[PDB]
């Protein structure tokens, strides 16, 4: 029964600098703030931080880890809250919020110790 309320397994990710830098560059985002601490600090940011293309990719991964290889992602909408700085750990949680004829909606929240880093809504079809 694809169930409204279904809970996705937790995913905890440690944002060490290798993670932040490698994801930013693999998304072809060379903005200094994701790999140059001095440039992040120059804009008042605490340290380097994860970029939004990586947030989108991680939300996708989190949902398909649960949904499986046959899942077809239709849309991802997200809003950022607090930054994901080097050495923060983000814990992803998720819940199915809608099921309508093969089409499922999942709410995802990634939280770090301070607060909600990312809040996302994902629409997908599952087989």
């Amino acid at each position: 029964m694809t169930v409204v309320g279904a809970v996705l397994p937790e995913l905890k990710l440690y944002g060490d600098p290798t993670f932040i830098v490698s994801t930013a560059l693999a998304t072809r985002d060379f903005q200094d703030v994701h790999h140059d601490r001095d440039k992040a600090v120059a804009q008042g940011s605490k340290d380097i931080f994860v970029n939004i293309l990586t947030d989108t990719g991680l939300v996708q991964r989190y949902v398909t880890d649960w949904a499986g290889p046959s899942a077809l992602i239709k849309s991802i909408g997200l809003r950022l809250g607090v930054p994901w700085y080097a050495y923060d750990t983000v814990t992803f949680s998720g819940e199915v919020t809608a099921v309508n004829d093969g089409l499922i909606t999942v709410k995802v929240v990634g939280r770090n110790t301070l607060g909600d880093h990312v809040t996302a809504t994902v629409e997908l079809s599952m087989r």
């Binding site: 994801t23 060379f30 008042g44 940011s45 990586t54 990719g57 398909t64 290889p69 849309s75």
Partner: protein, 165 residues
Amino acid sequence: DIQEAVAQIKAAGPSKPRLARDPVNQPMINNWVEAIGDRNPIYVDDAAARAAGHPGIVAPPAMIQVWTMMGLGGVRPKDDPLGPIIKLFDDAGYIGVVATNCEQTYHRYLLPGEQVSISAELGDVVGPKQTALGEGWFINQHIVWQVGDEDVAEMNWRILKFKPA
């Protein structure tokens, strides 16, 4: 001054379609799934992709924006709508930047070898607003990606340009 620049950019219309530096390709998929840590086999194994109903390996949907990034060597086209706005804020001291919202829709999955193009339009620029990082302006942008004349994905996203406190 800001809103005049915004009007002038909007009036120029959506940017002329620009081809991604590379077609969708396995080496870049490999780099991305490696860093993101996404072990979904459909991005790296043809047989897995076929068991999931695809013709062969497909690209992760969330890689759409990756294909058309400028990177280090890319030179922005003259009709780029976002570049001039970024420059205006930078020159005025709003050198801080953070992306704040991203909504992407994926019409279908892309295959290695397909050539993506991008067209972008400047949305509303809103401010000045007092944020946790300082005074700033939110810049909205709508992007469409095509393969040939077929729309394959769309994005609305928002970035904050701000003066650091």
